[PDB]
């Protein structure tokens, strides 16, 4: 229902912080398998949001915009990862505002440690897509692929040698593979236990497996 060249992909500017916040609220957090599988509340927290938004000033937040409608219709958030990150995430978890964000941090740390992208390929760091979300209303415009391809092209231009992500739905994994990413590690979300032996995520079968997938750039 929209002219296809009315769709613009670009880096979000710092001054657009609030519109990034808005798209994350509307189309990302309500559908993210990790977030919504959590057994003590499905909504996201402020410390989760603060993390996502910290990347806007770094210039690695990519938006899809309907320029006619002057509206964000897609978003992807990425950042560097490097050895040492998982331990630092666990440390932040001990002091963060919510138990939920602390619990998710520890999950993400496990995903990152297990994947070991930097170790596996001999890198000092890699580019990791934290978030990839598309407004369902704008299906049929290949937005997911375009957002991911944009992050690939961008990180390559910034001198990163690998891009990764944790792909938490069967669709997002298929997209990743389509663009040449190989899934090198995985985790059954239902089977994840923290260091207290507790089961903190209870997913629908659509979000049953999380695959970390990587592509050399």
Numbering used by the authors: 1 to 217
Excerpt from the paper describing this PDB structure:
Although aaNAT5b recombinant protein displayed SAT activity to all tested substrates, spermine and agmatine are much better substrates than others. Although aaNAT5b shares only 8% sequence identity with human SAT, they have similar biochemical function, i.e. both acetylate spermine.
In an effort to investigate the structure-function relationship of mosquito SAT enzyme and the substrate selectivity, efforts were made to crystallize its native enzyme and to soak them with its substrates or substrate analogues to determine its complex structure. After extensive optimizations, X-ray diffraction data was collected from the crystal of aaNAT5b soaked with hydrazine. The overall architecture of the structure is the same as in our previous report, with RMSD values of 0.1 to 0.5 Å between chains. However, a disulphide bond between residue 183 and residue 213 was found in the structure and it links two β strands (β7 and β6). In addition, residues 1–5 were modeled in the new complex structure, whereas they were not modeled in the previously reported structure because of the poor electron density in the region. Spermine interacts with Asp166, Val129, His130, Ser52, Asp48, Tyr28, Glu32 and Thr168 by hydrongen bonding and Tyr29, Phe51, Ile34, Trp101, Leu108, Val129, Ile131, Leu132, Gly165, Phe167, and Ser172 with hydrophobic interactions. Agmatine, spermidine, histamine, hexamethylenediamine, and putrescine share similar binding residues with spimine, but the enzyme has less interacting residues with them. Human SAT forms a dimer and the mosquito SAT is a monomer; mosquito SAT has a disulphide bond, and human SAT does not; and the conformation around the substrate binding sites is different between mosquito (two helixes) and human (one β strand), which may explain the substrate specificity of the individual enzymes.
